[PDB]
Every structure is written in C-alpha cells, then in structure tokens.
C-alpha cells in the first residue's frame, strides 16, 4: 500500500510538469538542457538566499507567530525574481519560450529539492496522511505561480512596456512575491484547515494568473 | 499515530513444560471480534466483553494478536466479570499459544480506536457491495505495531529469599517454629501481578508477627523458650523454588543444625487477607501429643471462643509426587519430613484468586486481615507459652493494649506491597522490594540473611523471558481500494490538465476578444 | 569529499552531530525550528567542518585554477617547415607542486625527528630547541602541538585569532614558507634539467627554433624568463598556501594547491596523449 500511495503522489507531482513541457513545445526546441541550467540557477539563488538570511537576520525568540520573520522571508523571495530574470536574459528565444523555460526549470528544481525527499520518506511510511497529496497539488500550484512570476518579470523587463502598464506589472510582482507571506499570515489568523488553505492558495494563484495573462495579452496586442 | 503501553502475557518454562505466549512482535491491522476473518489481525477485546470462547475463536482463526483492554479501576469493574476472568485465567496460562496476547489499560484514544474498528468491522456485512466499497475507501484503518524485539530467555535470573531468626531462652537447642510466607505474586501479566491478597496479606501477617514476637523476646520476663524463624520465600508460585533451596541449604549442611533436629513445626501463611473461612491444609493429620497437634487445637479453640464469626476447619490433602507443581508450600517441608501446614482462606489451591491479576489492594479487607492476624498471633503465643496448660482461659486475648496489632501499620505494609508488582520475573536481587523487606526484618529480627537460588544451566527448573512490557503504536492506514480510486482520480485530473493546456489557445483568443471589446467600450 | 558528505555521527556534548557539513546542514535545517539559527551554527561550527570552510575551499580552488592558467607564450617556428606556429608556454608555476612537496617533506622529517628526540631525550637543550610537544585535548580529538622550538615556528597557526595572539610566529611561518618555496624552486630547476639551457636543448632536438633567433639565442631568451618565473611562482604558491590556511579551507591550503595542480597536469597529459 505504501508504495502505491507514494507512486500516486509522485505521479501527481511529476506528470503535470511533463505535460506542460511537452504541450508548450519546449521539447521541440530541445530546451531540456536550458531547463537544467535554470534549475542550477535556482539552486545557486536558494543557497545565496539562505546565506543572506543567516548572515543578516537573527532568529526571534518570541513564541508568537513570527510576523517579522515571515515578512523578511518574503522580502528575500525577491532574489528568486532576480534569478528568473537572469535565466531569461541568459536564454535566447521568443518571450513565451523564455518564460516557459525559466518557469519550468525553476519549478522543477524547487520540486526536487523541497518535495521529493519528503514524498520519498514520508509517503512510504505506514501512516496515511493527506498532506503528501496536498503537497503534490501544491507543487502544481507552485508551477503555475512560477509561470506567472516569469511572465511578470519578462513584461517588466520589456523595453517597450508602456508606462501606464508598468505600475500594474510592479503591483502584480509585489503581490506575487508577498503571496506566500500573506497566505501564511491568513492561515494562521483564521486557523484554516489544510484543505481550505490549499484551496485558498489555488484561488489566489489562479487570480494572479488570470490578471497576468490579461495584462500580457494587452501588452502584446498594443504592439501588434 | 497513538502510542500506548501494552503488557504481554507471560512466557516461562517450568520443569521443561512451555507456558504462555512465545511471540512478542506484532505488525497487523486492528480488528474487533465481530470481524468474520481475524487471521493475521490484531483482535481488540474489552474486559467487559471478554469471553473465553471468543479468545479461543481468535486463536482458532490464527489471529495476529489479541489485545485485552482493562478498565482503569479494577474495583470499578463488576465482580462477576472479574470472577469469570479469574476462573479463565489459569486455563489461558496453561494453554501454550503462538499468538501474542497483550493487556492494555484503557485510554480515551484507545477506546475511540476500538469503537472505530468495531464500526468498520460491522459495516461490511450490513451494506451492498458498492456501499461497502465506498465505506471501506473512506474508512480509516489502524495498524498495530509493537516497538519491542522478540523475547529471549533469561539464563541467569536469581530468586532471593530473606530469613530472620529470634533465639529463645535456652539457645539454639530449643525447638524452632518456622513461619513462612512467599512474597512473589503471579498473574497473567507480571507487571499487573500485584498479588495483594496472594500473598501480600501473608507477608503482612508475617511481619506483624515478627514485630510482636520481637517485642516479647526483648524483655526477659516475656522471653519465650522457643526459636522463631521467619522466612520470606521467593518463587513460591513457581513450585516453591526458594523454599526448596533454603531447605536444601539448611538440611544438607551439617553446620545448619537448627532445622535438622529442632523444628517444632512450620506454619505457612497463604492468602489470609480475605474471607470469613479459614482452612488449615495438612499433608498428614497431626498426631495427638505432637506440637503441631497442640497448635491445631489452640487455633481451633481461639477461633471458636474469641472469633466465633471465623469458620475454622482442617483440610487434608495427600501429597502427590507425580504432580509437577506442589499444591501447598507445606508439602515441600513434608517431603523433607518436617511437620508443616498451610493456613489459607482458600478452600483449594486451584482457586483463580490465588493466581490472578485481579487480586488488588481493594480486594483485601483491612479488618479481616487484622482479625486473622490476631487469631494467628494468639494461637502461636498460646502454643509458645503453653498458656492452656497454665490455666489461662481461651476467651482472654494476650494481644491487647501494649501488644495490640496495629491496623495502620498493616495497611501501610499492604499498600507498600501492592504499590509495585512483585512477580518473580520482576523482583531483581537489588530491587527496592527486597532491600526494604530485608531492612524491615532486620529491625525486629536477628541474623537476617538472603538466600539466592539460580536455575541449573544443564537442567533449569524455571526459565523466564523478557519483553513483558512493550509500547504499541496504532498507525492510521487506508485500504488498497482507496489508493486505486485515488489513482483513477489522478489519471482523470491529468487528462483534464492535458486537455486544458491543449485548448489554452481558445482561452487566449477569448481573452484577446474580451480585451478588445473592453477597449472599444 | 569525505568531510563534505560524511554520514558519520560524532557525539558532541550537546548532541549527536553529523560530521559531513552538507549532511549536518540538511539534518539541522529539517530538525530545528530555528532554521536561521541552525544554518548559522552550520556556517560557524567550532568543532566540525563548516559550510563557510567549504565555501572558502571552493573559492581557493577557483583562485588556484585562475593563477594556474597564467603563462608566457614564446613563439616557436619549425626551422625545417614554413608556416608552423607553436607557442612554448612558460607557466607561472613553472616548477609545479615540487617546491611544496620538497618543503613539506623536509618539514615532516623535521617534525618526526623532533618528536622522537623529545620522547627519548627529555630536557636536553638541543631537543627543546628542535621541538617540545604537548597534547592539547581542548574539547576535541587529541592533537599534539609543538609549544616550543623551531617546530612551533614551522607549524601553521590554526586561526586568525592565533595569528593575533602570536604575531611573531605567524610572520616567521610566512617568511619561512615563502623563502623555502622560492629556494626550492630555484634549486629544483637546476637539478631537474629544466633550466633554460636544457629546454633549448630539447627544442633543438625537436627541431623547433624561435623566429629570427639562433638556438644559442633561445637559451638567452629562456634564461630571462625561466628563473624569474620559477622564483615568482614559488613565492606566489607559498602566498596562496598561507592565504588558504588562514581561510581555513577544508583539506589544507597545501593540499588544495597540490590537488588542483596535479589534476591540471594529469588533464594536460591526458589531452596530449589523446
């Protein structure tokens, strides 16, 4: 049973990334090595982020929920945007290709580092927990979030982006960076159940995706 | 997961005969007795619902394990359920079972698990196959795992007996009366074998007698012309191993002259803490004119005159050498030809109360114990000082005022004995029980000594096993059908995701049209 | 690699700690609520290999490779055949790791002799001058440090703190390492047959001639660079070793230099044969 549950969790986490990779046409462009390079960039950025946090921020000893600490972590999450920009600048191609390569490589690298080991050790345990399935869904939400963030970074980095659109892009980037902190604060404040928290994260990511898509379409059409 | 303590049914070999459970490791799903198939399952039974037939049914079905849930208050449990369990308990111990049997004290989480398992077991019969599949898929299974390793034999367990002596006025040559009580408890679970009545009451009586005689022997005016030996024997429930070794050491060795020729009689105290009936068990009826007969006459006279409520009678059982286990401690002395008898409230040694985990401090009545102690003390004193020949009437109690038995000191001794289990496999040489018993005896008695018996390596009379106490962890689990349904759901989700990505162009065009319309308006 | 990834657990008094810096970092991050504090402890652990030490080793490794790449290209033409242009590279580390190896072997022999003399002949003035050894079990696996004599001056200071406490010792050690490396490099070129004359002979045997220069002229041109390259390279190698030791790089500054240069020379041999 434990192997079957682990296989189901692994399939749910992994297959959406493969489907996105095949359907987006990245396989046609032989982008796999570019995605691997993006993942290496993610590993480098995450190491720099951990080093920055340890060097500059002492751990708060207050028992109460560390609102300052979570806000600081979200502020450090800007490094992920910088890394995504570096990956897109390093990668040549159409804007959609750059966005998809950066998002897919970053999300896959995060999935491998953060969820595979917990899936491997925990999901093979005797005890059944919904948390592994929730984490597998959360990886798909992270993948969508990274796609949105990469699209936003590409739009802001566009030389031709009109000044009217620029504040909207900056606001969307701000919301994307602070989304994790806001969601954790909201879940703590409302004592939300794990399923409700996952649903709320999905809804927020979907709304961000829809707004980013609408802005992207408007920006492309304004130049078409 | 929920972790709770489980007490395993004891494993031991006596005279080469295997007893109890051989397995200590469990890794099976929990089920109730109601389940049709118990094979390779952990069967949960409550003591209130426990029946010997259902336990046999689980063994017949090769249950993976049996866990018996005990109510937290033994006194609270109805006395009929306890009586039935006590009667079944010797048969259960006598029967060797491969299936591990554990005892768990009730906990709210354990009860909730038991109820959930019972509901899951019942639901399977009541519903159509589609409903059963849906209920099974949504149901939570529990997996019971023991943290302990497989049990192993203890090759060098030592049973320790404590002896103390009071010398009479005239020295060692004077006739010696030996008062013996075994301190060890026995029951289905050693950790639950408090043995308050069996034989905590007897130990309490022995200690009170030791105090009273020590006080009498302190003063020359009250100093008797008898030697008194108080012996607290280990392994009484295991064929009186400690008594046998102590007899061998005293009688085989010429230096220990006290027992060879000077033993007036041996009084063994077993289960004297309860009941209004008192039975004197004798291997051979005392001959007229012998000191043992004098003691019997004094005991009957004191019971009839001072304590008419107490029904005293003599029970004669011939010793059967064929039987592996001696019925009474006095039989061991009788084999060595020492005159000995056992005083007990039990009509028969086979009573379940004598060897049950249900023998707890609440069962023992302090008033009954005090009365029996007074009767024994008066009878012994009357024999020792030959009061009846001196013309002292039977109705008059010697033990009044300064020599009155102390019911608070008896209650304290009973509480101390019952605070911890005194099973022979749990009583270590360095244990607090032995050290306290030796110190207490040493206060009132002279020449307190500890005798240690070890089973022979070539032919061990008794073998004990470890893993009597373990932690059992109940893990929540889902059945394989649930995983199959989840896999189907995941496949459908992946198909929907693939179609959504394939049709994303339609969404993109729709958004482009909506944005154009918004610009136009 | 072992210090980086070792799964062995060492029982530090507070707790069982993984020896491997990376494994310890992951275990501490997983098991500790204070992830930032656990990371800081992994970076600045006093008793076990640190992540900072690993980063220092990586930085040294990159720096050493960068210096290794420095070369002076001398244009050589085949005299017999027109148009064949080769460069004869005079590397900055012309004498290779051999000056380090010779210095370390000499120091090692000195330590062995000193420890024997101290063990067998306690209290003799010559023995004390050569070295006095004391076993310092300061909350760590026992290490015998030379507390007096020449061996003390030859020993590397364990930290910047020790350098601050004993500045004279650090200066003497640095001067000794640089001077010995330069001296060994110069002597090695003469002993090795790698002098400008010998290289010119090898080029003549290979029928390679510098453009516009006779074979005799080649010796003079090579003799301008090779002695300077040898001595400066030995000094640079000593300075890099001292810097890596002060930075606390895992595997030692000497070890890292030796590994990098040996790997580079093996790679060059592999490419040449291939």
Q: Judge contact between C92 and C232, C-beta under 8 A.
A: yes
- Distance, in Å, from the CA atom of B32 to the CA atom of A53, rounded to the nearest integer, reads 54
- Distance, in Å, from the CA atom of B173 to the CA atom of C70, rounded to the nearest integer, reads 109
**What residue of A is the nearest CA neighbor of C25?**
A50
Q: Per the CB < 8 Å rule, is B475 touching A15?
A: no
Q: Judge contact between B493 and A12, C-beta under 8 A.
A: yes
Q: Per the CB < 8 Å rule, is A221 touching B512?
A: yes
Q: Judge contact between B417 and B208, C-beta under 8 A.
A: no
Question: Please, which chains are in contact with A (at least 3 CB pairs closer than 8 A)?
Answer: B, C
Return all residues near A204 (Cβ < 8 A) that are at least 6 apart. Answer: A179, A182, A183
Largest CA distance in chain A: 57
A 132-171 near B (Cβ less than 8 A): 133
Q: Å from B504 to nearest chain A CA?
A: 10
For residue C202, give both structure tokens.
């090898």
Q: Per the CB < 8 Å rule, is A50 touching C34?
A: no
Q: Per the CB < 8 Å rule, is C43 touching A50?
A: no
* Method by which the model was determined: cryo-EM
Resolution (in Å) of the shown entry? 3.2
Q: What Cα–Cα distance (Å) separates residue B92 from each residue in A88, B9, B21, B240, B356?
A: 76, 9, 10, 22, 11
Q: Does A68 touch chain C (CB under 8 A)?
A: no
Q: Å from C51 to nearest chain A CA?
A: 10
Q: What Cα–Cα distance (Å) separates residue B239 from each residue in B97, B340, B382?
A: 22, 16, 32
For residue C137, give both structure tokens.
């079990």
Question: Please, which chains are in contact with B (at least 3 CB pairs closer than 8 A)?
Answer: A
Name which of B476, B479, B498 is nearest A19 (Cβ-Cβ): B498
For residue B469, give both structure tokens.
């106490």
Question: Please, which chains are in contact with C (at least 3 CB pairs closer than 8 A)?
Answer: A
- Distance, in Å, from the CA atom of C245 to the CA atom of C252, rounded to the nearest integer, reads 6
Lookup result for tokens 């420095």: C70
Q: Does A54 touch chain C (CB under 8 A)?
A: yes
Handedness of CA B293, B295, B300, B304 (dihedral sign): positive
For residue A66, give both structure tokens.
């560390």
**Residues of chain C positioned with their CB less than 8 A from the CB of A59:** 34-37
Sheet containing B153-154: which strands, arranged edge to edge?
A: B17-20, B11-14, B462-465, B153-154
Helices (H), C89-214: 98-120, 125-130, 150-154, 160-165, 167-192, 196-205
Neighbours of B432 (CB within 10 A): 12
Nearest Cα to Cα of residue B196 among B309, B362, B13, B388: B362
The helix/strand count (H/E) of chain C reads as 12, 7
Q: Angle at the Cα of B518 (from B514 to B520), degrees rounded to 5?
A: 115
Lookup result for tokens 């109705």: B395
Q: At what angle do helices C98-120 and C215-247 cross, to 10 degrees?
A: 50
Q: Per the CB < 8 Å rule, is C43 touching A54?
A: yes
Q: Per the CB < 8 Å rule, is A53 touching C43?
A: no
**Residues of chain B positioned with their CB less than 8 A from the CB of A16:** 494, 497
The pairing of strands C132-136 and C143-148 is antiparallel
- Distance, in Å, from the CA atom of C243 to the CA atom of C246, rounded to the nearest integer, reads 5
Q: Å from A38 to nearest chain C CA?
A: 21
- Distance, in Å, from the CA atom of A189 to the CA atom of A176, rounded to the nearest integer, reads 20
Name which of B477, B479, B484 is nearest A126 (Cβ-Cβ): B477
**Element housing C42 (H / E):** helix C35-43
**Residues of chain A positioned with their CB less than 8 A from the CB of C34:** 59
Helices (H), C44-137: 51-68, 98-120, 125-130
For residue B244, give both structure tokens.
């046998």
Q: Does A54 touch chain B (CB under 8 A)?
A: no
Q: Per the CB < 8 Å rule, is B512 touching A217?
A: yes
Q: Judge contact between C9 and C16, C-beta under 8 A.
A: yes
DSSP helix/strand/coil, C66: helix
A 20-39 near B (Cβ less than 8 A): 20, 23-24
Q: Å from A113 to nearest chain C CA?
A: 11
- Distance, in Å, from the CA atom of C56 to the CA atom of C247, rounded to the nearest integer, reads 6
Name which of A4, A16, A24 is nearest B483 (Cβ-Cβ): A4
Verify cis geometry, omega within 30 degrees of 0, for the bond prior to A179: no
Q: Per the CB < 8 Å rule, is A59 touching C43?
A: no
End-to-end CA distance of chain A: 55
Q: What Cα–Cα distance (Å) separates residue C54 from each residue in B460, C40, C253?
A: 62, 14, 12
Long-range contacts at B77-82 (CB < 8 A, ≥ 24 apart): B77/B47, B77/B48, B78/B48, B81/B47, B81/B48, B81/B50, B82/B358
**Residues of chain A positioned with their CB less than 8 A from the CB of B472:** none
- Distance, in Å, from the CA atom of C226 to the CA atom of C109, rounded to the nearest integer, reads 30
> What single-letter DSSP state applies at residue C142?
-
Nearest Cα to Cα of residue A8 among B106, B148, B31, B488: B488
Nearest Cα to Cα of residue B317 among B339, B276, B364, B284: B284
End-to-end CA distance of chain B: 61
Lookup result for tokens 């090695």: C188
Helices (H), B386-447: 407-419, 432-444
**Residues of chain A positioned with their CB less than 8 A from the CB of C37:** 58-59
- Distance, in Å, from the CA atom of B449 to the CA atom of A86, rounded to the nearest integer, reads 86
Helices (H), A116-193: 117-123, 130-157, 165-190
The pairing of strands B65-70 and B101-105 is parallel
| Domains of chain C, each with CATH number or no CATH | 1-272 (1.10.3370.10)
Q: Å from A54 to nearest chain C CA?
A: 5
DSSP helix/strand/coil, B468: coil
Q: Does A167 touch chain C (CB under 8 A)?
A: no
Interface test with B, best of A126, A130, A206 (most B CBs within 10 A): A126
Q: How many Cβ contacts (< 8 angstroms) between chains A and C? A: 18
Q: How many Cβ contacts (< 8 angstroms) between chains A and B? A: 61
> What single-letter DSSP state applies at residue B63?
B
Long-range contacts at B13-18 (CB < 8 A, ≥ 24 apart): B13/B460, B13/B462, B13/B463, B14/B238, B14/B239, B14/B324, B14/B325, B14/B461, B14/B462, B15/B239, B15/B324, B15/B461, B17/B324, B18/B96
The pairing of strands C71-78 and C208-210 is antiparallel
Contacting A with CB below 8 Å, chain B residues are: 1, 140, 143, 145, 475-480, 483-484, 486-487, 490, 493-494, 497-498, 501-502, 508, 511-512, 515-516
- Distance, in Å, from the CA atom of B249 to the CA atom of B45, rounded to the nearest integer, reads 47
Sheet containing B227-233: which strands, arranged edge to edge?
A: B311-316, B277-282, B340-344, B263-269, B176-182, B227-233, B158-166, B446-454
**Residues of chain B positioned with their CB less than 8 A from the CB of A213:** 508, 511
Q: Where are the beta strands (DSSP E) in B168-310?
A: 176-182, 227-233, 263-269, 277-282
For residue C212, give both structure tokens.
């516009």
- Distance, in Å, from the CA atom of A12 to the CA atom of A198, rounded to the nearest integer, reads 15
Name which of A50, A55, A59 is nearest C34 (Cβ-Cβ): A59
Q: Do chains A and C touch (3 or more CB pairs under 8 A)?
A: yes
For residue C239, give both structure tokens.
């300075």
């Amino acid at each position: 049973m434990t192997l079957f549950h682990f296989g189901n969790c692994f399939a749910l986490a992994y297959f959406p990334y493969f489907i996105t990779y095949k359907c987006s046409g990245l396989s046609e462009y032989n982008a796999f090595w570019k995605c691997v390079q993006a993942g290496v960039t993610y590993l480098f950025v995450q190491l720099c982020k951990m080093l920055f946090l340890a060097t500059f921020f002492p751990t708060w000893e207050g028992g109460i929920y560390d609102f300052i600490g979570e806000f600081m972590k979200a502020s450090v999450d800007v490094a992920d945007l910088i890394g995504l920009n570096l990956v897109m600048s390093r990668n040549a191609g159409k804007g959609e290709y750059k966005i998809m390569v950066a998002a897919l490589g970053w999300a896959t690298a995060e999935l491998i580092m953060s969820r595979c080991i917990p899936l491997w050790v925990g999901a093979r345990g005797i005890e059944f927990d919904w948390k592994y399935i929730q984490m597998s869904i959360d990886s798909n939400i992270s993948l969508v979030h990274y796609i949105v963030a990469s699209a936003q970074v590409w739009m802001i980095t566009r030389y031709d982006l009109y000044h009217t659109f620029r504040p909207a892009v900056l606001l969307l980037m701000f919301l994307s960076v602070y989304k994790a902190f806001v969601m954790e604060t909201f879940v703590h404040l409302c004592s939300l159940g794990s399923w409700t928290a996952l649903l709320a994260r999905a809804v927020v990511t979907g709304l961000l995706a829809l707004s980013t898509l609408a802005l992207y379409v408007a920006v492309v059409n304004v130049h078409s | 997961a929920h972790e709770f303590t489980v007490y395993r049914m004891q494993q031991y070999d006596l005279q080469g005969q295997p007893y109890g459970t051989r397995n200590a490791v469990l890794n099976t799903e929990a089920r109730t007795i109601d389940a049709d198939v118990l094979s390779r399952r952990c069967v949960l039974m409550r003591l209130l619902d426990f029946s010997y037939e259902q336990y046999q049914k689980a063994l017949r079905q090769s249950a993976g394990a049996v866990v018996i849930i005990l109510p937290r208050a033994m006194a609270a449990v109805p006395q009929d359920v306890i009586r039935q369990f006590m009667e079944t308990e010797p048969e259960m111990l006598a029967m060797e079972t491969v299936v591990p049997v554990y005892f768990a004290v009730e906990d709210e989480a354990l009860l909730s698990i038991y109820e959930q398992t019972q509901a899951a077991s019942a639901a399977q019969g009541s519903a159509s196959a589609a409903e059963v599949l849906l209920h099974t898929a949504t149901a939570n299974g529990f997996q019971m795992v023991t943290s302990g390793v497989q049990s192993k034999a203890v090759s060098d367990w030592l049973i320790t007996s404590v002896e103390g002596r009071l010398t009479g006025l005239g020295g060692e040559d004077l006739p010696t009366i030996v008062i013996v009580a075994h301190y060890d408890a026995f029951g289905v679970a050693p950790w639950l074998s408090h043995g308050a009545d069996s034989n905590g009451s007897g130990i309490s009586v022995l200690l009170e007698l030791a105090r009273l005689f020590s006080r009498l022997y302190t003063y020359k005016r009250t100093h008797a012309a008898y030697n008194l030996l108080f012996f607290a024997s280990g392994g009484g429930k295991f064929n009186y191993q400690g008594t046998k070794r102590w007899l061998e050491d005293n009688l085989d060795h010429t230096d220990s002259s006290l027992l060879q020729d000077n033993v007036a009689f041996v009084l063994c105290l077993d289960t004297v803490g309860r009941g209004d009936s008192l039975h004197l068990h004798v291997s051979k009826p005392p001959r007229e004119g012998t000191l043992q007969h004098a003691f019997l006459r004094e005991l009957e006279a004191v019971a009839a005159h001072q304590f008419p409520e107490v029904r005293f009678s003599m029970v004669h059982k011939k010793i059967n050498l064929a039987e592996d286990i001696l019925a009474w401690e006095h039989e061991r002395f009788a084999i060595r030809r020492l005159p000995a008898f056992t005083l007990s409230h039990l009509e028969s040694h086979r009573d379940g109360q004598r060897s049950s985990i249900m023998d707890v401090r609440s069962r023992v009545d302090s008033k009954t114990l005090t009365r029996n102690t007074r009767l024994i003390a008066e009878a012994l004193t009357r024999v020792i000082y030959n009061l009846t020949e001196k013309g002292t009437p039977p109705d008059m109690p010697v033990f009044t005022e300064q020599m009155q038995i102390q019911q608070e000191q008896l209650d304290s001794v009973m509480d101390w004995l019952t605070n911890q289990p005194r099973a022979a496999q749990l009583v270590d040489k360095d244990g607090t029980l032995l050290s306290t018993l030796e110190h207490y005896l040493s206060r009132y008695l002279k020449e307190v000594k500890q005798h240690h018996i070890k089973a022979d390596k070539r032919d061990p009379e008794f073998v004990f096993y470890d893993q009597l106490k373990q932690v059992m962890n109940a893990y929540r689990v889902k059945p394989a059908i649930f995983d199959l349904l989840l896999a189907v759901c995941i496949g459908a989700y992946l198909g929907m995701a693939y179609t959504a990505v394939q049709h994303f162009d339609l969404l993109y065009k729709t958004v482009q049209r909506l944005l154009v319309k918004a610009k136009t308006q | 690699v072992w210090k980086a990834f070792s799964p062995t657990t060492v029982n530090t008094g507070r707790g069982m700690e993984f020896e491997g810096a990376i494994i310890a970092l992951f275990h501490l991050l997983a098991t500790r609520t204070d992830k930032v504090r656990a990371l800081r402890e992994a970076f600045y652990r006093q008793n076990l290999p640190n992540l900072m030490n690993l980063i220092a080793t990586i930085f040294v490794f990159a720096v050493v490779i960068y210096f290794q790449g420095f070369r002076v290209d001398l244009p050589i033409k085949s005299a017999r055949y027109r148009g064949q242009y080769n460069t004869y590279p005079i590397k900055l580390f012309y004498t290779s790791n051999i000056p380090i190896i010779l210095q370390s072997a000499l120091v090692s022999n000195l330590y062995v002799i000193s420890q024997m003399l101290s063990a067998r002949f306690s209290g003799n003035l010559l023995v004390s001058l050569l070295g006095t050894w004391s076993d310092t079990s300061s909350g760590g696996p026992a290490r015998a440090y030379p507390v007096g004599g020449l061996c003390h001056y030859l020993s590397p200071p364990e930290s910047f703190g020790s350098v601050l406490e004993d500045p004279v010792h650090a200066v003497v050690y640095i001067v000794f390492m640089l001077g010995s490396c330069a001296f060994f490099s110069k002597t090695w070129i003469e002993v090795s047959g790698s002098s400008a004359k010998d290289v010119a002979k090898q080029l003549k045997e290979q029928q390679m001639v510098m453009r516009g220069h006779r074979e005799t002229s080649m010796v003079h041109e090579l003799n301008r660079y090779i002695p300077t390259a040898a001595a400066f390279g030995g000094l640079c190698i000593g300075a890099l070793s001292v810097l890596a030791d002060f930075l606390g790089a895992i595997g030692s500054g000497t070890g890292i230099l030796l590994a990098v240069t040996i790997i580079y020379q093996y790679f060059e041999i592999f490419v040449k044969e291939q």
